[PDB]
């Protein structure tokens, strides 16, 4: 028998781990001996497994399966249902949960050197993703998972796109989910996504880390304050595009080291070509960690 083939009927629900707009993740024990001794795994499934969604989810699964990196969650296998061929994605269970939750919980008990360890690890997962010509589109602490206090991994690829062979961006024609407060200006105006727009989002992740996920300071709270809390629906996108074009940016987080804030603002360059590379970010971050240690 083949360990990447999981039989649905042996997957026992233990608890719900997260829910997003089209999918959820559950903690399950894969327990074919039925004695509660089987492996605990994380299971992603669709809430509305329509034909169109299933096609996208099967691509997402092939994307994950193709990635093998210390800072990318490990694919374990898939569950197939009889008939309509519903799919479940089986992944390693990372027991400290999302980095967003983890940091919200421990706050400044996690110090700067540890935040920079996480930053370096995120940078390296992304740099590796870019070698495969994948654009994540949703890089945010809510999509990063914590294996243990010394290792984080990019943990979800639901918005991930594969670049066409002849172009350095992917244009999304009819967006669903759009985490606009993490989006580069060209992603807001033209729905164009690229390694450089993931770099813009990584700058937002760095902001998240350094604000310790304080709610009143989250990217949506701060951008809504800068455009005015009265803006709603499609007008938020309009005013956010105008704000970014005028160099309105998230503020320096309280207590943030200068050199870290410098990296965020360089990621938030309006000129796509001036944003740094993930290769360079990982070098720079590791130099900072070295200097600090």
Shortest distance in whole angstroms from residue 197 CB to ligand 953: 19
Site track 37-76 with ligand 953 (rule: CB under 6 A), x = hit = -----x-x----------------------------x---
Least distance between ligand 953 and beta carbon 237 (Å): 22
Long-range contacts of 212-219 (CB under 8 A, 24+ apart): 212/103, 212/104, 212/107, 212/108, 212/110, 213/100, 213/103, 213/104, 213/141, 217/253, 218/181, 219/181, 219/182, 219/250
Q: Is 155 assigned to a binding site?
A: no
93 near ligand 953, judged by CB under 6 A: yes
Separation between Cα atoms, residue 56 and residue 244, nearest integer Å: 31
Q: Is 187 in the site for ligand 953 (CB under 6 A)?
A: no
Residue range at the interface with ligand 953 (CB under 6 A); choices 19-27, 103-111, 170-178, 210-218: 19-27
# of chain residues touching ligand 953 (CB under 6 A): 20
Considering the rule CB under 6 A, would residue 154 count as an interface residue with ligand 953?
no
Stretch that binds ligand 953, among 30-38, 90-98, 109-117, 278-286 (CB under 6 A): 90-98
Please tell me the distance from the alpha carbon of residue 148 to that of residue 236, in angstroms, as a whole number.
Answer: 37
Does 98 participate in binding ligand 953 (rule CB under 6 A)?
yes
When the beta carbons of 20 and 77 are compared against ligand 953, the nearer one is 20
Query: Among 72, 94, 213, 256, which residue sits at the site for ligand 953 (rule: CB under 6 A)?
Result: 94
Residues sharing a CB contact under 8 Å with residue 159, sequence separation 6 or more, in sequence order:
136, 137, 138, 177
For residue 273, the SS3 value is: helix
17 contacts ligand 953 (rule: CB under 6 A): yes
C-alpha 206/C-alpha 212 separation (Å) is 10
281 binds ligand 953 (CB under 6 A): no
Question: Are 231 and 225 in contact, with CB atoms under 8 Å apart?
Answer: no
Residue 2 is a catalytic residue: no
Interatomic CA distance for residues 76 and 61, integer angstroms: 10
Site string for ligand 953, 126-145 (x = CB under 6 A): -----------------x-x
Q: Does 79 bind ligand 953 (CB under 6 A)?
A: no
Task: List own/partner pairs for 31-40 with CB under 8 A and 24 or more apart.
Answer: 32/7, 34/10, 36/12, 38/10, 38/12, 40/14, 40/93
Supply the DSSP string of 206-272, one letter for each residue.
Answer: HHHHHTTT-GGGSHHHHHHHHH-TT--THHHHHHHHHHHHTT--PPPPTT--HHHHHHHHHHT-SSG
Q: How far is the C-alpha of 19 from the C-alpha of 53, rounded, in Å? A: 16
17 annotated among ligand-binding-site residues: yes
CA-to-CA dists, residue 185 to 129, 233, 276, angstroms: 22, 17, 16
Spot the catalytic one: 56, 138, 198, 254: 138
Which residue lies nearer to ligand 953 by CB, 17 or 240?
17
Nearer to ligand 953, 25 or 61 (CB): 25
Beta carbon of residue 177, minimum distance to ligand 953 (angstroms, whole number): 10
Does position 167 bind ligand 953 by CB under 6 A? no
The residues that touch ligand 953, with contacts defined as CB under 6 A, are 17-20, 23-25, 42, 44, 73, 91, 93-94, 97-98, 101, 143, 145, 155-156
Cite the annotated binding site for ATP by residue number.
Answer: 17-25, 44
User: Looking at the annotation, which residues are catalytic?
Assistant: 138
């Amino acid at each position: 028998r083949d360990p990447t083939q999981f039989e649905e009927r042996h997957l026992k629900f233990l608890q719900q781990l997260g829910k997003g707009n089209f999918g959820s993740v559950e903690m399950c024990r894969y327990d074919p001996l039925q004695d509660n001794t089987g492996e605990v795994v994380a299971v992603k499934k669709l809430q509305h497994s329509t034909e169109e969604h299933l096609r996208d989810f099967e691509r997402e699964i092939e994307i994950l399966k193709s990635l093998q990196h210390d800072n990318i969650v490990k694919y374990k296998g898939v569950c197939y249902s009889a008939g309509r061929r519903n799919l479940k994605l089986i992944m390693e269970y990372l027991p400290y949960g999302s980095l967003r939750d983890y940091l919200q919980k421990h706050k400044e008990r996690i110090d700067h050197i540890k935040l920079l360890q996480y930053t370096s690890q995120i940078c390296k997962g992304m740099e590796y993703l870019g070698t495969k010509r994948y654009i994540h589109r949703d890089l945010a602490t809510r999509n990063i998972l914590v294996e243990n206090e010394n290792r984080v991994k990019i943990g979800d690829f639901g918005l991930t796109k594969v670049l066409p062979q002849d172009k350095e961006y992917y244009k999304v024609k009819e967006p669903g989910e759009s985490p606009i407060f993490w989006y580069a200006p060209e992603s807001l105006t033209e729905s164009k996504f690229s390694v450089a727009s993931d770099v813009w989002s990584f700058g937002v992740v760095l902001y998240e880390l350094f604000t310790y996920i304080e709610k009143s300071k989250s990217p949506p709270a701060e951008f809504m304050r800068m455009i005015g809390n009265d803006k709603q629906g499609q007008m938020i996108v309009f005013h956010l595009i105008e704000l970014l074009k005028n160099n309105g940016r998230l503020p320096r987080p309280d207590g943030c080291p200068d050199e870290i804030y410098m990296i965020m603002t360089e990621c938030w360059n309006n000129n796509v070509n001036q944003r740094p590379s993930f290769r360079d970010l990982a070098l720079r971050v590791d130099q900072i960690r070295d200097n600090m240690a």
